[PDB]
Each structure stands twice: as structure tokens, then as C-alpha cells.
Design a protein around this ligand. Structure first.
Ligand SMILES: CCCCC/C=C\C/C=C\C/C=C\C/C=C\CCCC(=O)O
Ligand SMILES: CCCCC/C=C\C/C=C\C/C=C\C/C=C\CCCC(=O)O
Ligand SMILES: CCCCC/C=C\C/C=C\C/C=C\C/C=C\CCCC(=O)O
Ligand SMILES: CCCCC/C=C\C/C=C\C/C=C\C/C=C\CCCC(=O)O
Ligand SMILES: CCCCC/C=C\C/C=C\C/C=C\C/C=C\CCCC(=O)O
Lengths: 160, 160, 160, 160, 160, 160, 160, 160, 160, 160, 160, 160
């Protein structure tokens, strides 16, 4: 009983946190990225190698993707127990996959230094990241929230 | 039955994905485009030759264009089975044409280097693109979604 | 019968296209305009001579102006066949005048080079435009939409 | 009868024109203002002397000020012919005063050159304005609209 | 009777004026502040000494603070003559205090020059302000509006 | 009785103050941060060491976190005295913890100078902060509001 | 009799004037030559077109060339009236030819402005010369001295 | 008797002073000449107008010119009282003319500021001279030496 | 008889011309060499490829080398007809070899443009030379003098 | 007896020291003089105020001036005991005057900082000198040598 | 017999070649040395590591050192066969040692690229040399001359 | 006997080495001295603290000073065994004192890094020296030569 309330509260909290404040930490991600070199075009290559995909893009995609089964169920109901089981299983699988993917993609920390050896950069150069601590805190917070969501989903699945 | 629900869900998902996050990857498309030269006016010419039309503009136009028949049908109903068949055929043709056009215009990847030989640039110069990986991922995702939409439309057409 | 539906659909489509995407192509119109000279104040004069009025301003003004008769009719009705005829004639005249004015003002293409001979620029200098292809495509699209609107208005006028 | 409808249409048209497009022509008023000198602080002084108050600020203030009597009448009615006469007289006086003030403040054209002789600028220097033609067109359009409004108000006043 | 209507109109007018146009004059307050020196860090110190708190921040705080008693009364009524007297007294005191505080903080004019003698600036340097005339006009207008509000509040207090 | 009204008023006042004006003081936090050195990458490291987390982020997180129990209670009621006691205790604990955390994290003032000795900066360098006075005022105001909230919560807890 | 003394004095005076002070006016001929353009390589082309050969080089060559017959006569005498006549004729011819060549090459004045239309310069540009007045004075002085020398040589030739 | 010794000593002293130290004060005459403007080509024009001919050039020419009669007399003697008288008269005339010419050309002081109104400089600008005091001292010293020389020459002329 | 005198005069003339004026045309050979690129190190490589050895170095070496046999003969005489013949043959061979080498190394003209395709320069770039006309004139003059010397040496060789 | 030898040795030593090494310490006197300001023309004024006359110029003038009586005596002897006495007195007076003048002009040390308050510099600025220690050592050494010379001259004067 | 003449000629030729032209190739050795980095102080360290001692310094030292025995012999003779033998042996040893030292120090070629990994340079950077070809030619020429000198010295030693 | 010859040879060798090549290593001593900071005036102070007196100045002074007794003896002889002894003692003392002074002033090596903590430099900064290896080699060579000179002087002193 309380599990559903907690799940809804956690989902809304995650959505609000991502929407309100997330899109400002990464505003100047590339403008403040500097490398120690004179070669034109090294900054772009090194930034693209360091950060292939931004964290906020991944989190937005995950948020939108993990809420499709509810829309499908609502649409079916409007047009109108098996659907419940199928959607619960799909939600659990989606959440677990997204959590594992985040872990394998980003890790647990954002270092303040990067070593870049991509053309046109000559040999290996050093580049400096902007705001590592805030991004590390964001990473840890999102991981914790996703873990709580996964735990609640598994508990609900095992209830039936 | 389920086909209509899936089609609506896919359409709404595509619209949301394009609207929320698409208009930020391409924000600094031209500000971070750099060429290796001293000649004034080479950057503008080379950028215009590399990217005649931005991806987001094309996707917005496609999204708006593929939803006209529904508006026409709604307007006719408000003023008030042949119309259904005609609009289904028109939608299928529009989707197929837009998919083929996207493929012929952009391809499947965005390279990180460009070779530019347009006046006033002297002989051939080299220019460097910003964020190739994110744009490649966006291209592949949009192509997949459009393919799914085309498949569903063809299935619905063949149902009757 | 279908003519009214098509006219409304075209009007709404034009309004949406102008509103959503139009105000971003011209965002950096003057920041990326460069001339080959060292004289202060030549860039401003040459930009003002090349582009006295931006396209988006003209299109917004046209959109707002071509929808006044409907507001007048609605206001008269709220306060409450001759008015219908008068407003149809006024709309036709406004649309034709705006189309001819656009043609005489801008033409059909935006060249990538400009020759500037305005004070304080010494003799004749060369300046380079930003994004000619997108603006040419926009010009052609708007001209086509306006032509379709004019054709439909003339057909409706000749119906009675 | 038609006079009231025309007055309302003109007021709404003016408000929409000012709101939608006005706040973008003057966005870079000071960033693109350049003077021919090396002295620090001459640009700020010369810009402040050339343009003490921006046009858009004046127009917004005028728009907000010329619509107070209607609010007063509505509030009195909610709390609940002399009030009608008093508010008509007040509106006429406000409109005439604002028109005369605009004429005495700005004139009919915005020149492309300015001569500046304010400290710390040494002797007389020359400064260059950005977008004179668009601002001149805006000035003329606003003057015409205000004149039409004044004419309609005087006609309504003389009706009774 | 008319006093309440005038007070409400003045309050709404002040709120609208502050909200719509106020937040654009001060947009580039610090970017266009220049001092005549080569020492790093002198600009920040001199700007902070010249303008400890921006005018718009103070005005927003005053606007929000002078409308608390109404919210308290509304909340008490929803939960449900002494409260009326207490809230009137509180409003009068708040308005008078804010007016006196504004006068003691800012004055009546914004000079175009500042003399700065704060570390790390060596001896005394000169700095140049941006847009003094507009800010002076804003100061005078806000002072006049606040004075009118205080007069009306005192009249209402003395009525009973 | 009055305690609930005061608590609600204080909460709404805090939310409005944070939302409307807070997100503009810290807009240029990193762009105007300057250090006295020539070494690339020293600015980023020194800024990250001086300000690990921005104040506005912390305040937004606190505001969102201190209002979860109300949402939980509302959800339980919609699904439908112990819950009241539990949520009151949780709110008190959350507020006290957040206040103590703010005190231990930030303190009571923002100095205008910082001493930085982080790699790649050689030995110890000096960096200069932007807008210390406004941020100090914000710190003190937020601390006072939070203290008032804690006092009211403790009073309500002791009432029962 | 006096003619020989005057000729020797004039020759020595010319040599001393050229040697001592001539090689310093033209020291910064190319470093202070500036053109109004941004195109790389325009300065070199325009300087080479304006001044194919420096004046001092021509004068040094003339000085060395007009004194060969004396060396030939001295060498013949050391090895040891016809030779006298032949060398006088040769000297007269050399002096006349050099004077006419100087006139046809340089003229009588050095203007302070030049119009340059050589690749890579686009269309026609303007360039600014350094020290026109000193070079004009030098030109006139050298022409006068050469004329006096020619007159004396012709007088000596006609004596016999 | 002593007059000849004093004249020879003064001549040798003047020659040595001019030769050894004179050619270093004016080494950076044009490199350190700065004008307050942004217009290319204003520095060259203003420097040429301020200093048409350098002082050292004039002094070298005067030194070389005032010693020709001695060379003529020596040459005549080698080839071998009227010549004595003629050369004395010529020397006196040359010295007086050169002194008057120096006075009319340069004056008695070198100011530290110049007002320049020559094309391409717009209106009147201000330029700053390098080393005024040393050049003033040099001017006065040379004038005094030349005056002493003239006095001695006149005394010798009047002796016979 | 006259041949020896002419040969000595030509040799001395060549030596004087090379010594006095040659070492100033090439003073700024590398400082004024500019290439159209942003790549560091392209200027050095392109200059070294365009001008492996300077003309003046070659001419100085040739001048010193073509006068060794005279020194050898003088030394032998001091220590003290076959030697005469041997040294004449050696001189003729040296002069012919140096002339042919100059022709094969440099040619007859110095172009004003160079095409450079050496690492690190990307593809082919364009570089601009300084003072082509003076260097071409010098080349032609030196070639003519060397040819005259060779002709005289051959005539003397054939005399015996 | 030994006094004459010591005087000659000291004079030659002073001349050699001044000639060989003196003219290199002051080579970059003005190029390395920097002031903390942005105002054009402040560097020239402040340098001219700090160093009206260079030390080396004064020392060269003194060296040349203190050796005139010997030249006068030599000239009189060539043309050919009172002259001896007169020249000794003149030399003593010249040396004493030059020593006192040096002391009153320069002092005993060259500080590394200067405070400048001359137009166009605003208020008082700070400027930094180049090579204070070497110049101080030179000052002390020259003062000591001049003192020794004065002592020897006085001893010789008192001998007779 | 001829060996002594050849040795003297070679020595004088080497001295002249080194003196006249050698001191101009290396004039801009360090000014045109560029490295691809932004770190201050990397250029100095990398230049010092690449070229510890300049070639011209070594050659001058060798030239001066290999001619001491002749001075010693001349001094002994002036003061006035064993000395002959001793000085010949010393000269041979000195020449052989200097040749071997040159070979071990410099080699046979000067590359156009250098790899630098000295503090403060981060990891390994690339630097570009100026005029490699001329310096290689100089190296080879000096080596050949020194070898010829060594051969002649050994022949003379073996003669006795 | 041989000792005098060796002493003269060493003295002449030292003089030649110092004169010919010494004055070029230190030509750019201050132009290539760089410190890691942004503060104006830190470079001058740090250079003056690192190198109070240049090595070449000290060596020139020592060379000139150690040869005074010979001049005194020559002058006494021209005017014309105790003098011999006195001058030998004076020379020995001068040489020993100069050697010890050099050791105490400079040491044995020139490091490539310097730590500077002089006003206006903030705290301690790092500066980079130019050409440490050449200067170290020069130091060692001069020390060795001076030691040899001292040894020879002591041997000569002990001979008698
Ligand atoms: C300064 C505050 C303004 C923030 C503006 C930023 C973004 C727009 C708002 C939300 C987008 C962010 C995250 C995902 C939110 C909603 C997805 C809809 C899900 C659904 O419907 O199933
Ligand atoms: C210029 C004014 C515009 C400001 C835009 C900025 C931010 C968007 C608005 C609010 C976010 C700021 C603070 C927290 C507010 C609400 C949290 C929701 C709490 C709940 O629902 O429990
Ligand atoms: C600052 C003064 C130093 C000036 C140095 C400049 C040049 C060197 C001197 C002279 C060269 C100039 C002009 C021609 C002079 C002599 C030619 C020799 C003629 C002959 O022998 O038949
Ligand atoms: C401004 C004029 C000063 C020029 C100074 C330049 C160079 C020094 C002089 C001459 C060197 C140039 C060319 C070759 C001359 C002589 C070689 C000696 C031949 C021999 O002895 O067999
Ligand atoms: C442009 C030409 C001027 C060149 C000036 C350069 C240097 C000065 C001259 C010579 C120094 C160079 C090399 C060695 C020469 C002589 C050493 C003396 C040997 C001895 O006496 O035993």
C-alpha cells in the first residue's frame, strides 16, 4: 500500500529535480573546457572524446522512456489484469537496464584532468574540466534515486 | 487494435523528444565551427557548404507536415469513410517521402573533419565540427523511430 | 466547402512555421556579418545597406495584418452579408499587396557576397553573409505558401 | 458605432506589435555602438548622450499609462454617466500629451552618425549607430498609429 | 471610497512596471562597467563598492514584502475588525520604512563617474558607469509612486 | 491557530523569494571569477575549490526536500492521526538538519579574496570573487528565514 | 681652372652627404608602411608596387658608376691625351644618362597616399607612406647637385 | 690672435658633440610617437606634419655646408689675399643664414602635445611627443654655439 | 694590355657593389615572410624550402673563392711562368663553375608567390615573398658582371 | 711628480670606462619603462618627468668639456707660464662645477618606483624603472672618480 | 714547400669565412624558435636543451685556440729548433682534438624538428628550428676545412 | 723566462675572448626573461633581483682594472727597481681580490629557475632564465683563466 505512494513520490521528486536545476550546471560545459596547446581543432576533438554524451541528455531520455507503459495502459483504458503484469515486467526491465547502462557509461566520479591523444592533437595533451564536484554529486544522487526505484519495483513485482 | 495505441505513443514520444532536448545540442553549431586559415569569410562559406540545413529544422518541418491530414479531418467533422482512406494514403506517402529524403540528405554519420574548397578559401582547407557523436546518435534514433512509424502505417494500410 | 478548410489549414500551418522555427535562423544575423577592412564603422553601415529590414519582421507584420478583418467581424457580431463581402475584398487586396511587396523587396535568393561602397568604407569593399541557403529556402517556402493563399482567396471571391 | 470597434482593433494591434517584435530590434543597441577613439569610458558617455532613453521603454510606458481609466472604471463598477465623460477626457488628454512628448523627444529619423563632445572624450569624436533604418520605420509606424488613435478619440469626444 | 480604487490601481501599476521592463535596464550592469587601470581584480572590487545591491533586487523585495498582511488576512478568513486595524497599521509602517530606507540607500541620482580606492586598486582610480540617465529616471519614478502610496495609506488610516 | 497561518506565509514567501530573484545573482558566478596567473587551467581548479556547490542549488534542493511529507499525506488521503505526528516529526528533523548543514557548509560571509594552492597553480595564487555583498545578504536572509521556520515547527511540535 | 676645383668639391660633398645621413631616413621604409585591409600579403605586394627600387640604392649605384673612368686612367698610368678626351666623353654621357633616368624613374615628389590594385588585394585599397617630406627634399637636393655636375662637365668639355 | 684659436676650438667642439651623442636621442623619434585614435594612417600623417625634418639632419647639413670654403682654398693652394676675403665673407653669410633659418624653422622649445587635423585623421586629434626636454636642451645649446660662432666671425671680419 | 685593367676594374667594382649595399636588401628576408595559415611552424618550413641559401651568402663565398690563386702566387713569390699558366687555368675553371652553379641554383627571377606543401603545413598553402623586384635586379646585374668576367678570362687565356 | 701621472691615468681610465661599457646599460631605458594605466600618452610624460636627461649624456658632455683648455694650449703652442696658471684655474673651476651639478641633479641612488601625476595621467599613478642597481653603482663610481680628480687638481693648484 | 703555402692559405680562408658571414645566419636563432604549447617558460628550456652551445661560439674558440703556439714562438723570438718541434706537436694535437670534439658535439646535420620533454613542458612537445639547411651546409664546410688542415699538419709532421 | 711569455699570452687570450664573443650571449638577457604572473612591474623587479650586475660588465671592469700598473710604469718611464716590486705586489693583490669577489658574487652555475618574492609580485612567483648552459660554461672558463693568472703572478713574485 505505502509502496505505491513512495514510488509515485520518488518519481515526481526525480522529475522535478532533473527539470528545475539540472539544465544549468551543464550550460557552459564546452565553453569552459580548455586544453594546453596551440593546435586548432584540438579542443573540439578532446571534448568530444571526453564527453561523448552529456549526463542531462541521458537522464532526460531515461525519464521519458521509463514512463511509456503507463501511457499505453491509459490509452487502452480510454479506448475500452494481464496488461498490469506485462507493464510491471516491462517497467522493471527498463529500470534495471537503464541503471546498468548508466553505471557502465559514466561511473561514479568526474575527474578534473583528462589526457587526450586524438588527431589533430600532437602526441598526448592535457585538458581541464569545469565543475567536477557538482557533477559528481549529481551522479551519486541520481544513482541513489534509481537504486531506490529499482528496489521498490522489485518489491512490488514480488508482492504478487 | 494495439496498432493504433502504439502509433499514437510513438508519435507523442517523437514529438516530446524533439521538443524538449533537441534544440540544445545544435545551439552552438556555428560558434564552435573553426577552420585552419587566416582568410576572412572562409568560415561562413565552409559552414554553409558543410551544413546547408540544420537537422533540427528538417525534423521540426517533418513533424508539423506529417500531422496535417488529422487537422483536415477534424475541421471537416466540426463543419459537418472515403476521407479516412484518402488521409491514410496521404499520411503513408508523406512518411515514406520524408524518410527517403532524410536518408538522401544526411546519411548515417557526422564526420569530425571537413574539406572545404569554396571561395574565398584558397585551394582546399580543413575545418573541424563540434559534437559529432551526439549528432550521430540523434540521426540513428530519429531514423529508427521513423522506420517504426512507416512499418506501423503500412500495417494499418494493409489491414483494410 | 473544402476551400474553407484548406484555407484555415494553410493559415494555421504558416503561423506555426513562422512562430516555432523562424526566430532562430536570424538570431546571429549581425554578429556573424564580416567585412574585409580595418575602418571602424564599416560593418554597421554595410549591414544596414545590405539588409534594411529583416525577413522575419516583415513576415510577422504580414501575418498580423492579414487577420484584422476577422477580428473586426467578430467584434461587430459580439456587439450585435455586406460585411462578409467587404472583408473578403479587403483580405484579397491585402494578400495581393503583401505578396507583390515581398517580391519587390527581397527577390528569390540571398547571395553570399555583397559589395559595399557606403561611408565610412573607402571605395568598394566586400562583405560576407551568414547562412544564405537556409534563408533562400525560407524565402521560396514563404512565397509558395502566400501564392497558395492568394489562389484560394481568389477562388472564394469568384465563387460568389 | 464602428468607431468603437476600430479603436479597440487599433489598440490591440498596437499592443501586439509592440509586444511580439519590438523587444528584439533594440537587443544589441549598446553592444554594437562603436566610437572612433582609444580613450576608456568614451563609449558609455557617448551612448548615454545619444540615447538617454530607449524607444521601447517609452512605448511600453505609454501603452500601460493610456489604459488606466478603463481599469478604474471596471473597479468602480465591480465595487458598485459622469465617470464616462471624465475618463474619456482623461484618455484624450493622455494620448495627446504622449504624442507631443514623443515628437519632441525623438523626431522622425535616426541618423547613422553622431558627434560626441562629452568628457572623457577629447574634443569631438564620431560614433556609429546600429540599425538606423529599422528604427526609423518603427518610429514612423508608431507615430501613425498614435495619430489614428488621437483622431478616433477626438471624434468620439465630439460625438457627445 | 475612491481611495481604495486608486490604491489598488497604483499597486497594480507599480507591479506591472517593475515586472515587465525593469529587468532589462540592469541586464548588463557589470559587463559594461570599466575602470582605468591594468591591475587584475580592480573592476570587481570597484563595482561591488559602487553598487552593493542592485535597485531591481531592492524593489522586488519591497513589492513582495508590502503585500504579506493581505495574504495573512485571506488565510485567516479561509480558515474561519481588529485584524483590519492591525494589518492597516502594519502596512503603513512597512511602506514608510521602505521609503526612508530607499532614500538613505540610493539618493536621487546616479553619477556617471566613480572614484575607487579599494584594494587591490592602487591609490585612487576612476570608473565609468553604464546608463546613468535611465536609472535616474527609474529612481525618481519609483520614489514618486511610493510617496503616492504612502499618502493614500495615511489618508485611509486617518479616515477611521 | 495563528502559528499555521504564519508558517504557511513564511514558506510561500521563502519559495517566492528564491524563485523570482535568486537565479540572477549567481548567473555570472564563474565568468567573472579571475585569478592572477598565466597558467592555463588554474581558474577552473581555483573556482571549483572555492565554491564546490552553489548556494542556489542547495537552497532549491532544501526547498523541494522539506515539502515531501505533505505530498505523501495528500497521496494517502486521496487513496483512502498517527500520520500527522510522524510527518510533523520528519519535517522538524529535516529542517533542523538542513539548517545545521547550511551553517557548516557556507558560514556567514563571502570574502572578496581567495588563496588557491591547487594543481596546476604554482605555489599559492590569489583569486577575486564577484558580488560578495549581495551573496552575504542572501546568506543572512535565508538563515533568518530558516531559523524562524524551525522555531515555528518546534512550537507546533510542543503544542501537542 | 676654378672649374676643376668646383667639380671636385661638388663630388666630395655629394659623396659625404649620401654616405653620412642618407642611410637613416629609409631605415624603416617598409616597417612603417601600412595599408587599410585585412588580407594577408597585401602589404608586401603594395609596397613592392609603390617602391620597386629604393632611392638610396639608385644613388649609391650612380655614385660608384660615375667614378670608373678615373680608376681606369689611374691604373693605366700606374702600368705605364687621347685617354683624357675619351674619359671626359664617357663621364659626360654617364652623368646625363643617370640624370635622365632618375627623372623618369622617380619624378619630383613623394605623395603620402597610394592606390593599390594588385593581387591578393581585393579591388583597390589605400596605403600610407612614411616620411614624404624628407624624401621629397632629398630628391630635390640630389637633382640640383646632379644638374650642377652636368653643367660643369659640359663646360669643361666645351673648353677644349 | 686668440680669436682664431677660439673659433677652431668651438668648431671642433660642435662637430664632436653632434657626432658622438646627437644620433641617439632621435633614434626612436617615430616609434614612440602615439596619437589617440583608431584610424589607420593617422600616426604617419601627424608625425610628418609635426616634424617635417629632423633636427639632426639639419645640423649635419649645416656642419658640412659651413666648411666648404676651407676645402676650396686648400684645393686651390695645392694646385698652385683676395681668396681669403672672399671666403671669409662667404663663411659669414652662410653662418648668419643658417642661424636665421634654424630660428624660423624650429623655435626655442619642443612641446609635449600636438594637435593634428590632417587627413585621414577625423576632425582634430591629439598626439604625444617623446623626449621633449632633451630636445629642448639640444636646441638651446646648438643655438648658443652658433651665436658664438657668428660673433667670432663678425669680429674677425671687422678686424680687417 | 687594356684587358688586365678592365678585369681589375670589374673585380673591384663587383666587390664594392656586393660589400656596400648588398647586405641591406636581405636584412628582413625572414621577418617579412608570411604564409596564409594558423599552423605553428609552417612559416619556418616554407621559408627554408623556398630559400635554402640566401643569395648574398653565395655571392660572398664566390667572391672569396675566386681570389685564392692570387694569394697563393703572392705567398710563393714572397717565399722565393708555369705558376702563371696554372693559376690562370684554375681561375677560369672556378669562374665558369660558379656561373653555371648560380644559374642552376637561382634562375633569372624571384616570384612574389610560393606554393608550400611541407609538414607541418596541411595540404598546399600560399606564402608571400618580400622585395621580389630588387632581388631580380640584383640577380640580373650579378649574372651580367660574372659573364663579363668570364669573357675577359677566356680572352686572356686565348691570348697565350 | 707622481700627481701628474695619477691624474693622467685617472682621466684615461674614466674615459675608457664611459666609452666601452656605459652606452649599453641605458640602451633600453624607455622600452622597458612601464606604468600601471590604460591612458595613452602617460608613459611618455611619466618617463620624461622621471628622467629629464640621461646620465650617459651628462657624463659625455662633462668628459668633453673638461678637456678644452688642453686643446687651447696645444693650439697656441702650435701657432707659436701665464697660460698654464689660467688653464689650471679654469680646469679646477670646471671640475668643481660639474661635480656639484651632478650631485644636485641626480643624487646617490635610483629608486625602483616612481609616482607620476602629470597630464594626461589621471590623479597619481605608479611606474616601474629598469635596472636600478646597475645605475646606482655607476652613479657611485662616477662620483668617486670625479672626487679623486678634484682632489688631485686642488693639490696641483696648491703646489704652486 | 707548397705545403706551408697551402696551410697558410687555408687558415686565412677559414678565418675570413668565419668572420665575414658566419655571425649573421645565427642572429635570430632564438627569436624564431617556436614550440607548440601554451606553458610559459617551455620555449627557453627547449631551446637550451636543443642547442646548449651555438656553433659560431665553438668555431671562434677553436680558431683562437689553434693559433697560440705561433704567438708563443713569436714572443720568445722577440725576447731572444726544439721549440719548432714542440709547437708542431701541440698544434697537431689541438687540431685533432677540436675536430673529434666537433664531431661528437654536433654531428653532420641539423634536423628541422625537436622533441622536448623538459620541465615545465608537460609530457613531450614539438619545437621547430630555423634555417636547418644553411646550418647543415656550414657544418659540412667547416668539417671539410678542418679535415684538410689536419691532413696538412700530419704531412708536415711526417716530413721531419 | 717562459713565465713572462705565458702570462702575456694568457692576458691577450683573455682580452680577445672577452672582447670578440662575450658581448653577444648577454644581448637578450632581459628581453627573454619571463615570469609567470599578470602583475605589471614584476618582471623588472625579479630580473633586477636575480641579476643585479651582468657578468660581462664585471669582467670588463676587471680587465681594465688589472692593467693600470703597467700604464703607470710606462708613463713614469716616459717622463724619466722599487717601482717594479710595488707594481708586482699591487697586481697580485688586485688579481686575488677580483677572483675572490667573482666567486662570492656569482658562484659556479646559473640555474634555469628563480623564485621571486619582491614587491609588486604577490607572494612568491617563478621566473625562467635564458641560456643557462652557455653562461655556466663562460663562468667556469673565466674562473680557470683567472686562476692560472693568479698562479703565474704568485710564481713570479716568489721568484725574487
Ligand atoms: C528554470 C525552470 C524551467 C525548466 C525548463 C526545462 C525543461 C522543460 C520541462 C521539463 C523537461 C525535463 C524533464 C522531463 C520532464 C517531463 C517529461 C514528460 C513525461 C510525460 O509526460 O510522460
Ligand atoms: C524571472 C522569474 C522566473 C523564474 C524561473 C525559475 C524557476 C522556476 C520556478 C520555480 C523553481 C524554484 C524554486 C522552487 C519552487 C518550486 C518547487 C515545487 C515544490 C512542490 O511542488 O512541492
Ligand atoms: C653613420 C656614418 C656611417 C656611414 C656608413 C655607410 C656606408 C659606408 C660608406 C660609404 C658608402 C656610401 C656611399 C658611396 C661611397 C664610396 C664609394 C667608393 C668610390 C670609389 O672608391 O671610387
Ligand atoms: C655599410 C657598409 C659596411 C659594409 C660591411 C660589410 C661587410 C664587410 C666588408 C666586406 C665583406 C664583403 C664582401 C667581400 C669582401 C672582401 C673579401 C676579401 C678578399 C681578399 O682579401 O682576398
Ligand atoms: C660584417 C663584417 C664584420 C664582422 C665583424 C665580426 C667579428 C670581428 C672580427 C673577427 C672575429 C672573428 C673570428 C676570429 C678572428 C680573429 C681572431 C684573432 C686571432 C689572432 O690574432 O691570433
Amino acid at each position: 500500500m505505502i509502496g505505491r505512494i513512495l514510488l509515485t513520490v520518488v518519481v515526481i521528486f526525480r522529475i522535478l529535480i532533473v527539470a528545475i536545476v539540472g539544465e544549468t550546471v551543464y550550460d557552459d560545459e564546452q565553453t569552459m573546457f580548455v586544453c594546453n596547446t596551440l593546435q586548432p581543432g584540438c579542443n573540439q576533438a578532446c571534448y568530444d572524446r571526453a564527453f561523448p554524451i552529456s549526463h542531462i541528455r541521458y537522464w532526460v531520455f531515461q525519464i521519458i522512456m521509463v514512463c511509456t507503459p503507463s501511457l499505453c495502459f491509459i490509452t487502452y483504458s480510454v479506448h475500452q489484469s494481464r496488461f498490469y503484469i506485462i507493464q510491471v515486467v516491462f517497467r522493471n526491465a527498463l529500470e534495471i537496464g537503464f541503471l546498468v547502462g548508466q553505471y557502465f557509461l559514466y561511473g561514479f566520479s568526474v575527474p578534473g584532468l583528462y589526457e587526450c591523444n586524438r588527431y589533430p592533437c600532437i602526441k598526448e595533451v592535457e585538458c581541464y574540466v569545469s565543475r567536477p564536484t557538482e557533477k559528481t554529486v549529481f551522479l551519486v544522487f541520481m544513482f541513489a534515486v534509481s537504486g531506490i526505484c529499482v528496489v521498490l519495483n522489485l518489491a512490488e513485482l514480488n508482492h504478487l
